[PDB]
């Protein structure tokens with residue numbers, strides 16, 4: 156439970172490319188393209204939208220945890 | 227509550243776990259650890275947060291630009307609880323090669339964070355490709371001699387591309403639309419108060435941007451003010467992203483319009499396609515002269531110097547005159563006059579005076595070497611511009627209108643010599659600040675004789691000759707004052723017969 160939380164924080168830093176605390180659509184596109192994952196731009200924007208509960212266009216750490224620690 | 231992409235996130239997390247460190251062969255973990263204080267900034271709240279960080283920085287730079295040199299760095303995260311140096315992230319630490327003031331670093335951080343806010347605002351309009359400006363912070367190495375400051379940012383992997391500069395450069399090779407549309411969007415959405423240019427980075431992850439502001443007082447020495455805006459709009463060819471967000475095109479001359487339209491075929495072959503979810507462009511302003519004169523009229527408070535777009539056009543005029551848009555070639559005078567006309571219609575007093583002098587076939591300062599063709603329409607236009615400038619507070623134009631109503635010099639053919647109006651303008655000039663006694667004596671002469679609507683007034687003629695004599699004094703013109711006193715006595719002598 157403790158190292159899972161640390162793992163989730165590590166996973167958040169993978170996508171929060173600039174480390175401001177928010178995963179943007181551009182950052183997710185950059186990270187997906189760099190890692191060789193094959194997702195279209197529409198799929199990336201939809202990932203951000205799905206995890207964006209507040210509606211700011213970005214994914215904060217709280218929403219990232221909500222998405223990772225899910226049913 | 228439902229998440230249908232969790233496995234995409236997790237597959238990416240696993241791919242990263244087995245991804246090699248691009249800087250492994252530089253052995254930064256073997257560098258003696260140094261201690262630093264990190265200042266990070268929030269631009270919405272305008273607030274600074276500081277913390278203590280541990281860094282391992284390369285001893286020699288990997289690249290240098292014009293102003294700064296860059297060092298590879300590893301830094302331990304304070305978001306993680308117990309990160310080891312084997313997993314520390316990669317960072318670029320930039321330092322000014324020439325020593326600068328300590329506030330320059332914080333001002334650059336504010337610049338970058340404001341550009342990031344503008345990128346987010348652009349993203350909120352659902353563009354085909356979203357943008358993001360990398361956060362930049364400061365690290366202070368208080369144990370090094372001098373306690374040096376470094377800018378710190380995350381290292382972006384990929385092809386670093388400069389899409390545009392802060393001085394009209396545009397990357398036409400494999401042209402992209404998002405950077406230029408973003409810059410134009412920042413110009414319009416800010417109400418012409420700023421423009422975010424110098425777009426560069428990896429894909430749409432931008433860093434080292436530049437902001438041109440209306441006042442030009444903030445954001446360092448790269449802020450060329452309205453001139454910088456002009457440099458953008460001299461080269462910007464609006465693309466389909468500009469049009470999908472309702473951005474009005476900048477009014478360019480035919481020569482410039484063709485020079486920027488020459489790449490419309492490449493603009494049509496761009497890969498960035500619109501979806502239709504793009505919304506239309508804190509109070510935004512359009513970039514067209516017609517909509518701007520409509521807005522300025524909607525102000526109703528009849529004004530001058532109330533449009534930044536006019537100042538941009540004036541900057542274009544001065545750039546044309548200075549040789550900024552021509553090569554080792556005669557500079558384009560027709561387009562300079564085009565932008566001067568636009569600046570004048572937008573309430574730039576300098577432009578109005580310039581065009582009044584040019585259409586009146588008179589000597590002028592701005593575009594001095596340009597002489598316009600002489601027509602009757604041009605004479606009427608010159609007098610109208612001079613009268614508008616006179617009512618707007620220009621003393622030279624007030625004296626010229628006074629002389630036009632007095633002698634007829636430079637008077638429009640549709641008007642008539644009116645000595646009461648000439649007296650009005652002479653006095654408006656005298657109450658503002660060629661010498662005073664000359665104009666006072668001219669008024670005195672006009673009232674001594676009368677004519678052109680003005681009735682002979684010996685009393686006021688003598689009073690004004692007395693004022694001119696007192697003004698010849700305070701200028702070391704004794705004999706002139708004596709002659710003016712004599713002329714005052716002459717004017718008064720007519721009232722006793």
Ligand SMILES: Nc1ncnc2c1ncn2[C@@H]1O[C@H](COP(=O)(O)OP(=O)(O)OP(=O)(O)O)[C@@H](O)[C@H]1O
Pocket residue numbers: 289290291292293294295296318320379380381382383386433434
């Ligand atoms: N985060 C980054 N990731 C990768 N490369 C970077 C990064 N930041 C800067 N660079 C590289 O470092 C080079 C020089 O740094 P940069 O231009 O940002 O600063 P500068 O010297 O202030 O620039 P300028 O000369 O335009 O004033 C850049 O042209 C780019 O190639």
Ligand SMILES: Nc1ncnc2c1ncn2[C@@H]1O[C@H](COP(=O)(O)OP(=O)(O)O)[C@@H](O)[C@H]1O
Pocket residue numbers: 171173174175176177216266267268275301302303304305306315
């Ligand atoms: N400007 C800022 N002001 C306050 N907190 C910030 C700021 N930028 C980022 N953070 C917070 O710091 C966390 C990242 O810290 P850390 O990993 O130490 O930074 P970096 O990734 O830049 O090395 C983010 O997830 C966010 O909570």
Ligand SMILES: [Ca+2]
Pocket residue numbers: 171172173174175176177178179182
């Ligand atoms: Ca981010």
Ligand SMILES: [Ca+2]
Pocket residue numbers: 207208209210211212213214215218
């Ligand atoms: Ca969010």
Ligand SMILES: [Zn+2]
Pocket residue numbers: 406407410462463464465468473
């Ligand atoms: Zn445009």
